[PDB]
Amino acid sequence: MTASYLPSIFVPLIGLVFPAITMASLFIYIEQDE
Amino acid sequence: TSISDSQIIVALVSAFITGILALRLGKSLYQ
Amino acid sequence: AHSVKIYDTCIGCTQCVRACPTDVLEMVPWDGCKASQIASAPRTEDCVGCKRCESACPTDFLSVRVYLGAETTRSMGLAY
Amino acid sequence: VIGPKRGSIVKVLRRESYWFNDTGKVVAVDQAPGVRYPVVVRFDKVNYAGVSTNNYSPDELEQS
Amino acid sequence: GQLAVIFIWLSGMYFHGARFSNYEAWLSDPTHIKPSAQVVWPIVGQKILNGDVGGGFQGIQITSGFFQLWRASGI
Amino acid sequence: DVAGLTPCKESKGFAKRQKQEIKKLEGRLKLYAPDSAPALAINATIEKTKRRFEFYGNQGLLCGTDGLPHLIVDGDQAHLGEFVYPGLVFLYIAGWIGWVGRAYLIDVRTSKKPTEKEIIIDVPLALRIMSKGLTWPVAAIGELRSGKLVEKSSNITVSPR
Amino acid sequence: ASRFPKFSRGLSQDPTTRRIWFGIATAHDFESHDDMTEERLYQKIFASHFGQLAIIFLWTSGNLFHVAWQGNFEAWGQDPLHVRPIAHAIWDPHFGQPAVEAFTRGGASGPVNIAYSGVYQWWYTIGLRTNQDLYGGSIFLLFVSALFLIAGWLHLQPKWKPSVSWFKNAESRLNHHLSGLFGVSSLAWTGHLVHVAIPESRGEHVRWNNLLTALPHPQGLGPFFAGQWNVYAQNPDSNSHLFGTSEGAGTAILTFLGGFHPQTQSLWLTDMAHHHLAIAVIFIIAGHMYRTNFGIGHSMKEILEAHTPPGGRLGRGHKGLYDTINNSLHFQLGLALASLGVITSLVAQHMYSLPPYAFLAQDFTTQAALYTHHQYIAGFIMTGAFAHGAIFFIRDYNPEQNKDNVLARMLEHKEAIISHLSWASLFLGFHTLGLYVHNDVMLAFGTPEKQILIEPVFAQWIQSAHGKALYGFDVLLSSADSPAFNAGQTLWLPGWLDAINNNSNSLFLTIGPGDFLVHHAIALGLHTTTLILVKGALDARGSKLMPDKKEFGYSFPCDGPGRGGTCDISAWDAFYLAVFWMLNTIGWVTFYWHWKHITLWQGNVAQFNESSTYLMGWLRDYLWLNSSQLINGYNPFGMNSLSVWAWMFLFGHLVWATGFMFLISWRGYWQELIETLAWAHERTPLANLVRWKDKPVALSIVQARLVGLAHFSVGYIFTYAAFLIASTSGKFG
Amino acid sequence: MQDVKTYLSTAPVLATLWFGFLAGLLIEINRFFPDALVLPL
Amino acid sequence: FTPPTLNADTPAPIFGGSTGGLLRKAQVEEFYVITWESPKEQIFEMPTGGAAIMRSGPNLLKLARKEQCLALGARLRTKFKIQYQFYRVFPNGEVQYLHPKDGVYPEKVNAGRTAVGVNNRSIGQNANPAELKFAHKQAYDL
Numbered sequence A: 001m002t003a004s005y006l007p008s009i010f011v012p013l014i015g016l017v018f019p020a021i022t023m024a025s026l027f028i029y030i031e032q033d034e
Numbered sequence B: 001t002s003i004s005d006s007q008i009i010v011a012l013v014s015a016f017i018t019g020i021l022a023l024r025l026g027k028s029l030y031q
Numbered sequence C: 001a002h003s004v005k006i007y008d009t010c011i012g013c014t015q016c017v018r019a020c021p022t023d024v025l026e027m028v029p030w031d032g033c034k035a036s037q038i039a040s041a042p043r044t045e046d047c048v049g050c051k052r053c054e055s056a057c058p059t060d061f062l063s064v065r066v067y068l069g070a071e072t073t074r075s076m077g078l079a080y
Numbered sequence D: 001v002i003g004p005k006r007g008s009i010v011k012v013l014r015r016e017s018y019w020f021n022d023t024g025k026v027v028a029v030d031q032a033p034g035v036r037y038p039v040v041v042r043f044d045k046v047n048y049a050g051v052s053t054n055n056y057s058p059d060e061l062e063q064s
Numbered sequence E: 001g002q003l004a005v006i007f008i009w010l011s012g013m014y015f016h017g018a019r020f021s022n023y024e025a026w027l028s029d030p031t032h033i034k035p036s037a038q039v040v041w042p043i044v045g046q047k048i049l050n051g052d053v054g055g056g057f058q059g060i061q062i063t064s065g066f067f068q069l070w071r072a073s074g075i
Numbered sequence F: 001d002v003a004g005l006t007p008c009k010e011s012k013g014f015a016k017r018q019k020q021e022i023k024k025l026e027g028r029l030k031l032y033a034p035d036s037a038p039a040l041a042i043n044a045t046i047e048k049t050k051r052r053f054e055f056y057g058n059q060g061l062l063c064g065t066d067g068l069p070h071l072i073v074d075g076d077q078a079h080l081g082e083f084v085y086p087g088l089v090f091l092y093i094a095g096w097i098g099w100v101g102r103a104y105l106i107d108v109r110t111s112k113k114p115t116e117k118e119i120i121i122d123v124p125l126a127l128r129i130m131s132k133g134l135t136w137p138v139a140a141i142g143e144l145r146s147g148k149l150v151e152k153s154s155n156i157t158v159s160p161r
Numbered sequence G: 001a002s003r004f005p006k007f008s009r010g011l012s013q014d015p016t017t018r019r020i021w022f023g024i025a026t027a028h029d030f031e032s033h034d035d036m037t038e039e040r041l042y043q044k045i046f047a048s049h050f051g052q053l054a055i056i057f058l059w060t061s062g063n064l065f066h067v068a069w070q071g072n073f074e075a076w077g078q079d080p081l082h083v084r085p086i087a088h089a090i091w092d093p094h095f096g097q098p099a100v101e102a103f104t105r106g107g108a109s110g111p112v113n114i115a116y117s118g119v120y121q122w123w124y125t126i127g128l129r130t131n132q133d134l135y136g137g138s139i140f141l142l143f144v145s146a147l148f149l150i151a152g153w154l155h156l157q158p159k160w161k162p163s164v165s166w167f168k169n170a171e172s173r174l175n176h177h178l179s180g181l182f183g184v185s186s187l188a189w190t191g192h193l194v195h196v197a198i199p200e201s202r203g204e205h206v207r208w209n210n211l212l213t214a215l216p217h218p219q220g221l222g223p224f225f226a227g228q229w230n231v232y233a234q235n236p237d238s239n240s241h242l243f244g245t246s247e248g249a250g251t252a253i254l255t256f257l258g259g260f261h262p263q264t265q266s267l268w269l270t271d272m273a274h275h276h277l278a279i280a281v282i283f284i285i286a287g288h289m290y291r292t293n294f295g296i297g298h299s300m301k302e303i304l305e306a307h308t309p310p311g312g313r314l315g316r317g318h319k320g321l322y323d324t325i326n327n328s329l330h331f332q333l334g335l336a337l338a339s340l341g342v343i344t345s346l347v348a349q350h351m352y353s354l355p356p357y358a359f360l361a362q363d364f365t366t367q368a369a370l371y372t373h374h375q376y377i378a379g380f381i382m383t384g385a386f387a388h389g390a391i392f393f394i395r396d397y398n399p400e401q402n403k404d405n406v407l408a409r410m411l412e413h414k415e416a417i418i419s420h421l422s423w424a425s426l427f428l429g430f431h432t433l434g435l436y437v438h439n440d441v442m443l444a445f446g447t448p449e450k451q452i453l454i455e456p457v458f459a460q461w462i463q464s465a466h467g468k469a470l471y472g473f474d475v476l477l478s479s480a481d482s483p484a485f486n487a488g489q490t491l492w493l494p495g496w497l498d499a500i501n502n503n504s505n506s507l508f509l510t511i512g513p514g515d516f517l518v519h520h521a522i523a524l525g526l527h528t529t530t531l532i533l534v535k536g537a538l539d540a541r542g543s544k545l546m547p548d549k550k551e552f553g554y555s556f557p558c559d560g561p562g563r564g565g566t567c568d569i570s571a572w573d574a575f576y577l578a579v580f581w582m583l584n585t586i587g588w589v590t591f592y593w594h595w596k597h598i599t600l601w602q603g604n605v606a607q608f609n610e611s612s613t614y615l616m617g618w619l620r621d622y623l624w625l626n627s628s629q630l631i632n633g634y635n636p637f638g639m640n641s642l643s644v645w646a647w648m649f650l651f652g653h654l655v656w657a658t659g660f661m662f663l664i665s666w667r668g669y670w671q672e673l674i675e676t677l678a679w680a681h682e683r684t685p686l687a688n689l690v691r692w693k694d695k696p697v698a699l700s701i702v703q704a705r706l707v708g709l710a711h712f713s714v715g716y717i718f719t720y721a722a723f724l725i726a727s728t729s730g731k732f733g
Numbered sequence H: 001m002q003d004v005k006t007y008l009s010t011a012p013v014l015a016t017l018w019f020g021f022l023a024g025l026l027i028e029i030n031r032f033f034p035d036a037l038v039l040p041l
Numbered sequence I: 001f002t003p004p005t006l007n008a009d010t011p012a013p014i015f016g017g018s019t020g021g022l023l024r025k026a027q028v029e030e031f032y033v034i035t036w037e038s039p040k041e042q043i044f045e046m047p048t049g050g051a052a053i054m055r056s057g058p059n060l061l062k063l064a065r066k067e068q069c070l071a072l073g074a075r076l077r078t079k080f081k082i083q084y085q086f087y088r089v090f091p092n093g094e095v096q097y098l099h100p101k102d103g104v105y106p107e108k109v110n111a112g113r114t115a116v117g118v119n120n121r122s123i124g125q126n127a128n129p130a131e132l133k134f135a136h137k138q139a140y141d142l
């Protein structure tokens, strides 16, 4: 592997942060009254 | 032979651009 | 809410009105049958969709038809 | 008269009827001007709801 | 009626213990003879089910505990 | 030979299976006294197995790799006794049953209370209907040609299209 | 008030969590959205197709990138038969040290996954050799996906939006797709094979920097334009050829040998090149059939009207079918999915027996995974085709224009169709189950000679007609005096007969009574699934129980407990019930394939030939026997690389049972329970301060069925995939 | 006896009698003609 | 027929309390109020679960759903032979008379009632969905 640190970086993001942002945004969106 | 970090970052930039285009197409499908 | 329709095949037996648990149907004057009355649904917004009115209709196929849809608060039968 | 004679054997032409292409006996026909389905037909076999009789207009009943 | 049915069932168990069983052989040696009180007929190869339970007997090995109950009762 | 199958008479696997089954039965037999009833049962088993294998060999059954009779159902004249002959017997029996049942239904649709006749079968009527199934194919062909076998589509209930 | 389901006013006004579920689940039903116009519908479908193409190309580019970055593609190529392919690296923070060292395979420096998709063999066959080639391919496919995204955005713009009439131009679309999409693409692929793949397999290195310099044949394009094409087949590769090495290589680029490469046990590259060239010619010719703009061609509508038997047995024939098919997207979708499912089954059935990729036959787990994959995909596609046929009948079928044509005649005698399907299913099921139970009882009683073992002589006769000499029928390429044998002995038979008379491969495997019984089980499964699906499609518009089913739509729960009860009376419920049967049928198919190939690969085919005739053999010698290494993936004494497959095995079992939960208990229990829980939350201190906005409700009936079906299917797929991979890779045999 | 004969003519009693007779016939046939896979003719 | 007004001085039945009653919906969206006249003190069964004694005279009972009002009213009519009427009450103090809209129960035909939802054709004479494609209307709405 050319960059061994790069998995250790990316896996946490797409695993925890991306779901957090995605679900927070979708929860804010589906609970709008407009 | 094994790919280099320059190739890795080129792939990452290409994926970022494809993501921009995907978001654009999603916004075009939305409305 | 749900859409309830009455057809000219109705015989004015009133059995669909008595089976309704939310008082959606009522009998109105009519001249197309011996009973001189026909069912009607003036307040379908209270209909829950049980189709008990459908089970009580004696015609070959139903003179009263419930089509469901919308599923509003009164439709879902929620007390909370 | 309006439709078939009393007691006659009639065949049903209503597509939505449980007794389409089936034979029944006429019980009564109402002569009141305004009734849309005056002919009363009795059937030998019940439908899914358990009813063995129905009302038809003369134009959807044929003589055997 | 249920009591009559249960009586018939128990009478059947005791009959099958009397005739189609190796109860006495099991009494002579209870630690090495398998209890059996059901014997199949030799019709379609089902006779293989008459296994060697011991005591010079072949039959279905029963697991109802009737042998031990009759041993306790003094039969 | 009809898909590389040897006849079971000269099939070594068939004889091996014979020997193995007989040896297993004799091993089960060794633990019983000769005069005992279990011994008689096991000896009857041995005789039954021997006659079964002799019968299978005598009818020219086809054994594959190892000993297992295989059935040919392509219509070969040398194997008509496996599927065609018993198949025809089955067709005669099944058609008997169905034909007599149909006849009974016909004969009870003219009754005043047919449903009671279906839940409570008219045993004399049913029996004299059943007696008529001996020549069922002839009656079936006669009804087919006369037109009394198949109901016209104009008198059969159908759902809307 | 314009909430999350902006395409549905009714869902937006739902104050329950049903709004969220149905907005998620009804997003892609464009025809059902409010204020939907056919023009907007077609343009939205076009842009969604662009998006799907972009997603597919991203998926393949990611596969390429991961194999290039974390794989052993070069090491595998240097030594294919003793190197395990690597899919991608693993970075699981939850692993322990034993898990770290258990998953370090393929000569990696850390935990990796071993690929079972065949991408290594496929890319080695088509000429890719180094990681830089794969990286370039991945970058190129990223660019292609970006281009498709740009196109999808572009055709949605006001000045580049196509019109409805453009979307309904059937003749031009067929001409272009047959000529260019099918024919020219195959021509380009055979050009690749001639220029890159074949020279790579013969030791030459042809890339973009020497494409115009490298000469595919010593006599380049001379004999092509002179009509003496035989020059391109004069010197085929010898049987001592080593793939990728100049030793034993030839100079022919379009051969016709047939059979398999002796060293790779795969089809010759030159044979595939000639294949693609021939089908490209045929497709390019076929794409000139219809009339577009030049006064020559065909009118498909007029073809359909012309094809009516004069005797009236078919009624009006195919009159009005052109408009019915061109106006209904669901008819087109159903036809496309039917053809695609058939072709996917064909792909699965032809790649295991005729492996096109080098060193793919030796990779047993890859072959098994590929077969199971494409068979399950085909089954799902077939269910979709039938579901969309039902949707066509409900939503797009007009009896006025389709009057007495073939569709109306199918609707007229649908009772006969359904009754005959019922009879076929009943006969097959009764007799196959009875024979199996007979064999079970005979083995149970110790008398295996009393089994009813029916020899599949029809399929064996066909095998003999294909050149199989094992059964001794001696006809149609099994006999020397047959005219077919004499015609073919010069071109392919030297290779085909050698390949089919080799019993070490999967080309026309030997079959017996077990093969007879299992094929009849397969016929039962196909017939019963088709019965359910056709019954749903033809009773979709109505029935005696519900004559007005068309007004209620495709997926509705029921019609209430009146008239005896009307559960699962919709066509969507027919699809729901047919998904179970298709899962069962593909399970039988894959079980047979897998067991047959385990006993073939291990060399002991007698186990299958003796145990497949009774179901206890299936349970013990296949399921119980082959799961021993699977269930030992992790145990109190340690763990190994099969621990992940054991965990997935148990996971699939759990999801299967949760699907059972959603399928058995139906709705009311949960609605009352949720009422109680709402009371409890509203009465609890420190928690009644937190309030929901969407009133919690139990899942709806249709939603419950779909969720249970999804759980059932996911458990099915994961359990069988784990078992398949673990039992085919724990023992490479 | 009319009522007893009517009861004995009911579907379950007649089914029991007929199927028991059929089972006895098949069992006796297998007693005298057992373990046959081929109809000899 | 002049609809009656909802009196706020009507005593409620003797009930000991229950977990099935008014909830947050009653105070944010709506609830219902049923009134009936009884000749004597008798025990009836609450539609929400339990038993209560109705007053010897006017009664006033708060419900969360219209279906519970109909259930209690039907039991009162077919068991105690008691006339009843209920109202829909909103959080802002709006009261709507509901069940006898014209003073006569819906089972009995009454003049002055308009036919709503009545279709002048047979149920099987509906238009096909295909003919109504891309039109925002249903077959039964014609």
Ligand code: CLA
Residues within 6 Å of the ligand: E073, E074, E075
């Ligand atoms: C509830 C208590 C109870 C139970 C369950 C048993 C059960 C048994 N006893 Mg024990 N026994 C009991 C009390 C009990 N006994 C008492 C209190 C005594 C006196 C101390 C004895 C003394 C005794 C002896 C000495 C023997 C038994 C035996 C037996 C066995 C029955 C064998 C036999 O011939 O039965 C069938 C015989 C019967 C008399 C019962 C059948 C009914 C017949 C036909 C008469 C019916 C007429 C009758 C008046 C109807 C009454 C019905 C209703 C009006 C009440 C059995 C294990 C015998 C055995 O096998 O030893 C192991 C044996 O030898 N028992």
Ligand code: CLA
Residues within 6 Å of the ligand: A006, A007, A008, A010, A011, A014, B011, B012, B015, G055, G058, G059, G060, G061, G062, G063, G065, G066, G088, G089, G090, G091
């Ligand atoms: C769909 C294709 C695909 C898939 C399934 C994966 C899967 C994975 N990648 Mg890879 N990757 C891909 C394409 C893909 N990759 C491409 C095109 C690039 C070039 C930029 C990379 C570059 C890359 C790096 C550098 C790393 C991974 C890593 C990983 C792993 C952890 C997830 C992660 O961090 O993602 C990160 C992924 C990216 C940054 C690429 C962007 C996302 C791509 C373009 C796909 C997005 C669209 C796709 C259709 C999904 C749609 C969502 C949904 C509808 C299905 C996982 C095995 C990590 C790893 O190896 O851990 C062991 C890691 O460090 N990926």
Ligand code: CLA
Residues within 6 Å of the ligand: E010, E064, E065, E066, E068, E069
């Ligand atoms: C379908 C119903 C069914 C069936 C087929 C069986 C079958 C069997 N039971 Mg079980 N059993 C059942 C229901 C059933 N049981 C129920 C509901 C109870 C609870 C009352 C029991 C309690 C029970 C006990 C305690 C024993 C059995 C035993 C047996 C075996 C019978 C041996 C025998 O004849 O001894 C008949 C039983 C005895 C001689 C001893 C019974 C002693 C009890 C305390 C007397 C019953 C008192 C009273 C009548 C019950 C009601 C009490 C209530 C009013 C408080 C056999 C395996 C016996 C066994 O396993 O032997 C190996 C055994 O010891 N059963």
Ligand code: CLA
Residues within 6 Å of the ligand: G056, G057, G060, G117, G118, G119, G122, G184, G185, G188, G340, G343, G344, G347, G357, G370, G373, G374, G377
């Ligand atoms: C859910 C859908 C799905 C998935 C995930 C897979 C997954 C897989 N399939 Mg399967 N397949 C499916 C559906 C699916 N398949 C269906 C429906 C069919 C029937 C058509 C097939 C037919 C099929 C075949 C025949 C083969 C596979 C193979 C494969 C494997 C390789 C990955 C792949 O396809 O490369 C993804 C590749 C792409 C997305 C690129 C495809 C684009 C081509 C090259 C276009 C060529 C045109 C060109 C641009 C024209 C040139 C223009 C100009 C110069 C003239 C993988 C296990 C292969 C395999 O098992 O190899 C080991 C294999 O040989 N599949």
Ligand code: CLA
Residues within 6 Å of the ligand: G024, G025, G026, G027, G028, G029, G030, G333, G337, G380, G381, G382, G383, G384, G385, G387, G388, G391, G554, G555, G572, G575, G710, G714
């Ligand atoms: C070319 C392929 C294709 C296309 C374009 C369509 C397009 C369409 N279909 Mg069809 N369909 C297809 C293939 C296709 N389908 C196949 C293969 C099947 C068989 C399975 C079906 C079965 C089918 C049915 C039964 C129905 C449709 C419907 C529809 C329409 C709405 C779909 C929707 O709401 O999406 C939204 C998407 C979803 C709700 C899918 C959600 C995700 C599912 C449940 C799978 C999730 C599995 C799992 C949880 C994820 C993996 C987890 C992991 C841990 C393993 C739309 C016109 C519906 C329609 O027309 O309504 C009238 C309808 O009722 N389709």
Ligand code: CLA
Residues within 6 Å of the ligand: G422, G423, G425, G426, G427, G428, G429, G430, G433, G524, G528, G531, G532, G577, G578, G580, G581
């Ligand atoms: C092992 C489980 C199992 C079995 C045996 C069946 C069997 C059957 N299903 Mg069912 N089904 C199942 C699971 C099963 N299904 C599941 C899980 C689903 C998903 C929900 C379905 C969904 C489903 C649908 C949607 C349809 C079927 C249909 C069928 C029939 C197909 C034709 C056939 O095989 O005829 C042969 C018959 C059998 C194999 C049934 C068993 C026959 C027994 C063994 C003979 C009797 C033995 C004995 C005398 C009885 C003793 C009892 C008592 C008297 C002592 C058949 C009745 C189709 C149908 O009815 O079409 C006609 C149909 O439309 N099934």
Ligand code: CLA
Residues within 6 Å of the ligand: E044, E045, F089, F092, G430, G431, G433, G434, G435, G437, G438, G441, G450, G451, G452, H026, H029, H030, H033, H034, H035, H036, H037
């Ligand atoms: C549909 C599936 C199927 C089929 C085809 C068979 C077929 C067979 N089984 Mg199997 N079996 C099955 C299911 C099936 N079984 C199941 C589900 C089970 C589990 C319960 C078994 C358990 C089983 C056992 C345990 C045994 C068999 C046996 C047999 C054989 C003979 C049985 C018999 O009575 O023949 C004897 C022949 C007859 C009864 C002839 C019919 C007589 C009638 C009355 C006609 C009378 C003549 C007629 C009126 C005139 C006709 C014209 C004339 C010229 C002949 C036969 C090969 C037996 C055997 O021999 O194995 C090889 C055996 O031991 N089977």
Ligand SMILES: CC1=C(/C=C/C(C)=C/C=C/C(C)=C/C=C/C=C(C)/C=C/C=C(C)/C=C/C2=C(C)CCCC2(C)C)C(C)(C)CCC1
Residues within 6 Å of the ligand: G330, G331, G332, G333, G334, G335, G338, G342, G385, G386, G388, G389, G390, G392, G537
């Ligand atoms: C419901 C419906 C639908 C769907 C359907 C489906 C899904 C179907 C399917 C179907 C199918 C799925 C079919 C298949 C078929 C097949 C066939 C028909 C085959 C044929 C074959 C042949 C003909 C062959 C020949 C040959 C051989 C044998 C081999 C050798 C060579 C040759 C070629 C000679 C739609 C939407 C349309 C519409 C409505 C209706």
Ligand code: SF4
Residues within 6 Å of the ligand: C006, C009, C010, C011, C012, C013, C014, C015, C016, C017, C038, C039, C056, C057, C058, C059, C063, C064
């Ligand atoms: S709709 Fe049916 S139940 Fe209601 S009054 Fe008319 S006929 Fe009677």
